[PDB]
A paper describes a structure:
Erroneous X-family polymerase (pol) λ nucleotide insertion leads to genomic instability in double strand break and base-excision repair. Here, time-lapse crystallography with right (matched) and wrong (mismatched) natural nucleotides captures snapshots of pol λ undergoing DNA synthesis. The intermediate catalytic states uncovered reveal hidden fidelity checkpoints that enable DNA polymerase discrimination between right and wrong nucleotides.
This distance is too far to allow nucleophilic attack at Pα and phosphodiester bond formation. Triphosphate stabilization is achieved by interactions with the nucleotide metal, as well as with the side chains of Arg386, Ser417 and Arg420. The elongated Fo-Fc omit density surrounding Pγ suggests alternate coordination geometries with Can and Arg386.
Author numbering: 251 to 464, 470 to 575
Amino acid sequence: NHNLHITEKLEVLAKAYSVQGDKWRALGYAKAINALKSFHKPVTSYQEACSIPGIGKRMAEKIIEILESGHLRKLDHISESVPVLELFSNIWGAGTKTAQMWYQQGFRSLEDIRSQASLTTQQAIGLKHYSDFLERMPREEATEIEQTVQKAAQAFNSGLLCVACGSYRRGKATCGDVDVLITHPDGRSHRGIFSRLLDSLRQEGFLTDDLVKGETKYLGVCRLPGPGRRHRRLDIIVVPYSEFACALLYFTGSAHFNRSMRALAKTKGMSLSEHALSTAVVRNTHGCKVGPGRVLPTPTEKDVFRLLGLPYREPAERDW
DNA sequence: CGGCAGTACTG
DNA sequence: CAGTAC
DNA sequence: GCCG
Ligand SMILES: Cc1cn([C@H]2C[C@H](O)[C@@H](COP(=O)(O)OP(=O)(O)OP(=O)(O)O)O2)c(=O)[nH]c1=O
Ligand SMILES: [Ca+2]
Ligand code: NA
Ligand code: NA
Ligand code: NA
Ligand code: NA
Ligand code: NA
């Protein structure tokens, strides 16, 4: 990217808006930052600024102020609460509303939180792993965590397929957590083995805490055995085989890629989720689904793209 | 003006 | 439900 | 914040 001196300043404002709960404004900044991250050359004109998709007059004004001043004045009037709100919302299970409430209650540090705040069960796990959950692991370690889950699941049924998704499948060198998708061509055997799997991984000491436990979705905390190991976030989802392609696509991301793809499906009277790509979806004037539509067969990720009129993108090309 | 992805846990 | 999360 |  040849616009670092601009995007670096925009990232600051976008994070401020995010921690402060202004999610749609933050969203607009994010997209503009990506667009600026993509454009081939340094932006030099307000007209060249408005020329990019995701950059309006408001954002070009800011970009222009940067090129002529080397500075964005609004960065000087970011509230003093923002660093504290960021600190608090980096606790897993605390978001903007909880951080803002803690702030209004007078809390300013994690010592304040530890000693005086009311914490949910999730937020107490998040706090005790605060530093660890802010770390990314090398992908080599994501592979060891995936193999640990896979070998535990395959002990129950050899026919279980286990695939690490998210940034791991997109080829990144580091991973924020591990996303393991499980299915079975059986169409049936995926049922039941999920709860038994978690008990097996608990019994050996691999799983150290549970955050979310659904019937096909688990979010938790694991740590490989031996010295020099940190606690790592682990997500596991178990899906029927008929949903594998859409679950793989969802679980692989990126998040912004999924949202773009789902928005595109909406323009075409379709709807894409981790369960299925559906056609003939009826919506009202507020974009809210009013009728379900029909599931389209998607045996492979390529079918989803094809049915959406798009060229296939391999995982590494799905960061946005 | 008004949507901005679609879904799933928690309590 | 609101909040938080993937 | 942007865009239809
Ligand atoms: C956070 C998030 C994730 N997802 C999907 C796509 C993500 O790849 C997948 C796993 O969630 P993450 O683990 O948060 O995604 P990631 O692995 O891509 O993160 P990073 O690039 O920083 O390493 O869940 C959504 O569809 N929407 C979201 O808001
Ligand atoms: Ca991940
Ligand atoms: Na534009
Ligand atoms: Na958080
Ligand atoms: Na006090
Ligand atoms: Na994850
Ligand atoms: Na809750």
